[PDB]
Design a protein around this ligand. Structure first.
Ligand SMILES: *[C@@H]1O[C@H](CO)[C@@H](O[C@@H]2O[C@H](CO)[C@@H](O)[C@H](O)[C@H]2NC(C)=O)[C@H](O)[C@H]1NC(C)=O
Ligand SMILES: *[C@@H]1O[C@H](CO)[C@@H](O)[C@H](O)[C@H]1NC(C)=O
Lengths: 32, 32
């Protein structure tokens, strides 16, 4: 059941090269 | 031991119909 990525389902983690380098349409936890 | 609600004891969760809808004297996590 796709839901918006918010702080309720995301935690901050360190940099990993296997992650995704989002450049546009970022989720709220990755803004400002 | 009643203590103020803060990030030390409050964890963000998704919306649910069984939670209290608050309008006055909000905890700091729910402000702004
Ligand atoms: C996201 O960007 C980082 C850094 O720009 C990429 O990490 C690089 O990965 C290549 C291939 O393994 C390495 O040769 C580089 O040394 C890495 N750079 C750094 C700074 O560690 C990463 O691959 C990118 N991820 C995606 C999915 O594109
Ligand atoms: C809180 O508000 C939502 C939306 O109006 C409602 O569905 C829910 O029953 C309410 N819950 C309480 C405890 O007031």
């Amino acid at each position: 059941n796709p839901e918006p990525i918010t702080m309720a389902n995301a935690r901050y983690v360190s940099q990993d090269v296997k992650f995704e380098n989002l450049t546009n349409q970022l989720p709220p936890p990755l803004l400002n």
